[PDB]
Scaffold this active site. Sequence first.
Site, PDB file in Angstrom:
ATOM      1  N   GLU A  65       5.911   1.916  -7.803  1.00 51.56           N
ATOM      2  CA  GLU A  65       5.286   1.417  -6.584  1.00 51.56           C
ATOM      3  C   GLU A  65       6.307   0.759  -5.663  1.00 51.56           C
ATOM      4  O   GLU A  65       6.294   1.009  -4.460  1.00 51.56           O
ATOM      5  CB  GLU A  65       4.148   0.471  -6.928  1.00 51.56           C
ATOM      6  N   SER A  78      -3.834   0.845   7.432  1.00 57.55           N
ATOM      7  CA  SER A  78      -3.594  -0.170   6.414  1.00 57.55           C
ATOM      8  C   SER A  78      -2.137  -0.134   5.960  1.00 57.55           C
ATOM      9  O   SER A  78      -1.385   0.801   6.227  1.00 57.55           O
ATOM     10  CB  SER A  78      -4.531   0.074   5.239  1.00 57.55           C
ATOM     11  N   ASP A 120       0.393  -1.363   2.410  1.00 54.56           N
ATOM     12  CA  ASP A 120       0.553  -1.759   1.021  1.00 54.56           C
ATOM     13  C   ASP A 120       1.663  -2.788   0.871  1.00 54.56           C
ATOM     14  O   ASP A 120       2.748  -2.585   1.421  1.00 54.56           O
ATOM     15  CB  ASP A 120       0.871  -0.543   0.149  1.00 54.56           C
ATOM     16  N   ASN A 147      -3.265  -2.988  -1.123  1.00 57.93           N
ATOM     17  CA  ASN A 147      -3.681  -2.453   0.148  1.00 57.93           C
ATOM     18  C   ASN A 147      -4.530  -3.403   0.984  1.00 57.93           C
ATOM     19  O   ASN A 147      -5.455  -4.060   0.492  1.00 57.93           O
ATOM     20  CB  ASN A 147      -4.436  -1.142  -0.066  1.00 57.93           C
TER      21      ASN A 147
END
Length: 129
Positions: A35, A50, A52, A59
């Site tokens: 990630e 949006s 992250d 999110n």
Amino acid sequence: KVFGRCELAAAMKRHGLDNYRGYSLGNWVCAAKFESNFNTQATNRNTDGSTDYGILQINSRWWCNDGRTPGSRNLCNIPCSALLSSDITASVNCAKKIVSDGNGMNAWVAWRNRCKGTDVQAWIRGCRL
């Protein structure tokens, strides 16, 4: 902050993620690796407006408020900027909610693509925990 692998594993274990909802520590370290590459400051903007945030790429549509995401619902009750901290506490506390939200760790796309079904114990190789 960029964590070392074992450094992060120990911090995750301190915060109760080892075997949390039946997911071993290796799963969590693997998720963070793919990630964010262990970078607390990582951010990624999505096409939907949006973003992250942080070590576990949480999110802003559902989980944190960044004040620029239409239709957002701040379910961890925190500003998204708190997820960019050196201290992983806010990220871990919000991740526990997410993993309990009906999809297990499939909530993290990189976990699904790069970690799920693999020998995740390799991610805690060499760690003194």
